[PDB]
Curated annotation (Swiss-Prot):
Effect of E11N: Loss of 84% of enzymatic activity
pH relationship of activity: Optimum pH is 7.3.
Listed result of changing G30A: Almost complete loss of enzymatic activity
Subcellular location: Host cytoplasm
Name of the protein: Endolysin
Active site: E11, D20
EC main group: hydrolase
Mutagenesis / variant outcome for changing S117F: 10-fold decrease in enzymatic activity
Catalytic activity: Hydrolysis of (1->4)-beta-linkages between N-acetylmuramic acid and N-acetyl-D-glucosamine residues in a peptidoglycan and between N-acetyl-D-glucosamine residues in chitodextrins
Organism: Enterobacteria phage T4 (Bacteriophage T4)
Keyword set includes Hydrolase: yes
Membership in a protein family: Belongs to the glycosyl hydrolase 24 family.
Effect after changing N132 to M/F: 2-fold decrease in enzymatic activity
Keywords annotated in UniProt: Antimicrobial, Bacteriolytic enzyme, Cytolysis, Glycosidase, Host cell lysis by virus, Host cytoplasm, Hydrolase, Viral release from host cell
């Protein structure tokens, strides 16, 4: 298992513009287009993203291209971030994937706000961090996905994803 396989379990693949759990316009493998209520603003972001007139529909190919850019940008954001970098560097390979997952879902900013859990992860207090992470909007709004990521941090194995 690797970061792409993991995120693809969590995000799914949709080739036509769709709304987020949050009601936001998205496409592909969880590629958020706009937080704006117009399908028209979304379409325009889509064409700008792909470099063609898409009419709200992309190919697999275009979907995976956007996925590659997003994962790359997630990793780079982690590495550029003063709060995130230290925790990332301290972690093993599997747990590294769990933090990447959070960053992809919520952005750098969102995750850098989990102060206390970050602290506990650096300290390698796995059970404690799992309990603290659960106390969030994140867990309450997307419990199955949060629980898969949380187990990953807790155990350091890919078991939550075996099932899936």
């Amino acid at each position: 298992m690797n970061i792409f396989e993991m995120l693809r379990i969590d995000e799914g693949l949709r080739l036509k513009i769709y709304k987020d759990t949050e009601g936001y316009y998205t496409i592909g493998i969880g590629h958020l287009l706009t937080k704006s209520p117009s399908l028209n603003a979304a379409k325009s972001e889509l064409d700008k993203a792909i470099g063609r007139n898409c009419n709200g529909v992309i190919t697999k190919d275009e979907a995976e291209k956007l996925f590659n850019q997003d994962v790359d940008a997630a990793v780079r954001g982690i590495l550029r971030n003063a709060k995130l970098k230290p925790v990332y560097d301290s972690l093993d390979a599997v747990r590294r994937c769990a933090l990447i997952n959070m960053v992809f879902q919520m952005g750098e900013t969102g995750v850098a706000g989990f102060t206390n859990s970050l602290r506990m992860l650096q300290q390698k207090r796995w059970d404690e961090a799992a309990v603290n992470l659960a106390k969030s909007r994140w867990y309450n709004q997307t419990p199955n996905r949060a629980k898969r990521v949380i187990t990953t941090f807790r155990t350091g194995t890919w078991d939550a994803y075996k099932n899936l």
